[PDB]
Homo-oligomer: 273 residues x 3
């Protein structure tokens, strides 16, 4: 069965869009999810919705309960998780408003749990070393790409997200260094969400929306909260249209082989006594 | 009004120099400052002095209470914070003994709180994402530069500090990598001091004194505590003269616009419910 | 006297090999070592054996008690610590099965104590800033090199280990970035083991065994637990032969000057009140 966890800036909740809406507060072995899971049906496909920074944004990216979020989506039975994220563009040709279907990351985070297998829980015994060669679901990305071209939206079919610890924005020196590293976009939340998704055997893809060019331009104002907020307001419909047209397609594709493979990868990543 | 917090290796305390000296032990929402604040007047300008690693240097750079230090200077009413720091040179042309008026950093730290807005305190509610495009006060740096040329001291008008976690020094591989990154000087304390200063709406500049060339030279002894200590002893007067001649000038400049701008930046960085 | 702590994948325990075997559970100021120290004699040289991830591998590289391991070896009286480690090759010419006698590292770790001098213990008072220009014992490496050529084994006489936090493997973007950085091999345990060894005045060298090429190859399967495990099984005898032929030689060399120098370096790294 297809069940799609959706994380992020999605006005997808709900009434016209979400049929059979149910609000469910969840307690996981890793503590509390960011907010109540919102459960329902979007065009006859089972979905689960989750606001990353909580009821009206009160928790910093560093202190987001990533373990609880992923574990709670898996336990509802999600086979997919498709997320949305604001990001800074590190390249001229990724303009604010553009979607980037990222395919790689570089971790610049420092204070974040990145495994369920942390020694502390009976649900996750042993040590897990999960492969990250292909951090993002190949077939989901493809649908995301096909669908954005169907929508005639500006879109980059690939890209490397650098995830900074934050909550501060980058210095200029840092911005230029990530440029030399070959990173395309920058955020605060992609790691460890994607790593925990893979540990859980979930197919996970990210819709990244560029909102600013960070601070690397010498003659333009550098990123701020207010500039990200207004760009994000202007452009939020694109990520929303992309998901409404994507979700029909996911629920009408063959998935058993991808999910079987993802399950074995996660299974065989773990070392028991 | 002008009030200048001064952090670091400053024999500025006191008797000839500091008029109207007062020792004040402070308790902030973020715990204890590194040491008692020493309060007084240097050439008719209100100053506040603070030893970064405590009464006779007992705390590692990683465990320095950066939140408490900055918050306590702000609460005394500082409009400026000008700091001094030892550093390793990552370029031949920055010789030991040289001052670098840094203008950028690269964060290599890992275990450090970098925001007052951490979820825990009523004085700092919401999430703060502070811009870091220009981490250091433009007009203060300028005075620092003008004044060092007035002193005929060797000086670099700009520079990128890499801040390592420590307390160890860098491996050679690490030293060469920061070189390829375009870093000029290296230390253990610049981040998060500067980031917390900006969150507080304080104009903050750093006097960086090169003490060694780290370990990148193939045919010279690599950095050690004793080599830094003796270079620092030989060269400590330069940073002291620079501040005595700088402090008159700060207290005689126009500041209201810079501080208004810095206040709005900090104000508009924060997200409430 | 020579006493050699040996950490890692060593079937050196024991009966044919280890004379006068004794199992000793130890309590250090920094908590418990990874496992019981196994104590005895290998070709008439006093050795101490220690399994890094514990009795049948149950602790993640991030949560390994590095402070306890090193401190317990020092307190038994080790003058040397020679370790073995699996690693990913970041260069074509380092083939799986090859030994790399590493000589440098780059730290990509984030959540790890890296000093005994942490403020908390009477055995380690003050702040320690240990030089890392030459993180690995020069004369031990040399014996390791000479001995591998005597064994006619494939061997790289130098190399830069990047130590990632883990427990996940690297993304591809990350793999390529460490390549551009000039790293040769990749692991999860080298830092802070080597840094704590130096703080302790112990001569410390690493036998690194390449087990995989991580994920940088476009047309080969990326690293997994099972691929590392089988390569490691196939190649484990090489690291074992290298140590049996190395250990005679260490116990028959002049060491007093190296250890005196290493002791002064550690001594003079520390700042008391
Ligand atoms: N240059 C940049 N650097 C790092 N991250 C970002 C991001 C990504 N997030 C924006 C956000 C800061 S602004 C914002 C916007 C809406 C709301 Cl409700 C709350 C806050 C952080 O979660 C990271 C966009 N541009 C970035
Ligand atoms: N190559 C290098 N790398 C990192 N940091 C530094 C530093 C900066 N600090 C020196 C200092 C180590 S030596 C010292 C000197 C005086 C006293 Cl009272 C106490 C200790 C650390 O706080 C970082 C200088 N050279 C450096
Ligand atoms: N590409 C790579 N990246 C990071 N580390 C490694 C390592 C080094 N270790 C292997 C090991 C993962 S696989 C393994 C093997 C035997 C046992 Cl008993 C338990 C687990 C981690 O400790 C890091 C090899 N290849 C690596």
């Amino acid at each position: 069965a297809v069940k799609i966890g959706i994380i992020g800036g999605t006005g997808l909740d709900d009434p016209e869009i979400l049929e059979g809406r149910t609000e469910k507060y969840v307690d996981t072995p890793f503590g509390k999810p960011s907010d109540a899971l919102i459960l329902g049906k979007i065009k006859n496909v089972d979905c689960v919705l989750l606001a990353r920074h909580g009821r009206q944004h009160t928790i910093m990216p560093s202190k987001v309960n990533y373990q609880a979020n992923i574990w709670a989506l898996k336990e509802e039975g999600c086979t997919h998780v498709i997320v949305t994220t604001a990001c800074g563009s590190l390249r001229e040709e990724i303009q604010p408003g553009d979607i980037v279907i990222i395919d790689q990351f570089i971790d610049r985070t420092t204070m974040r749990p990145q495994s369920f297998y942390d020694g502390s829980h009976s649900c996750a015994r042993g040590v897990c070393h999960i492969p990250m060669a292909e951090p993002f679901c190949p077939k989901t990305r493809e649908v995301l790409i096909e669908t954005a071209k169907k929508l005639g939206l500006r879109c980059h079919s690939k890209g490397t997200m650098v995830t900074i610890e934050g909550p501060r924005f980058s210095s200029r020196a840092e911005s230029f260094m990530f440029r030399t590293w070959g990173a395309d976009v920058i955020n605060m939340t992609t790691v460890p969400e994607v790593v925990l998704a893979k540990e859980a055997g979930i197919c996970y893809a990210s819709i990244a929306m560029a909102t600013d060019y960070d601070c690397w331009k010498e003659h333009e104002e550098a990123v701020s909260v207010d500039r990200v907020l207004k760009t994000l307001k202007e452009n939020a419909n694109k990520a929303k249209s992309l998901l409404l047209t994507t979700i029909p397609q996911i629920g009408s594709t063959e998935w058993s082989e991808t999910l079987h493979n993802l399950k074995n990868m996660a299974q065989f990543s773990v070392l028991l006594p």
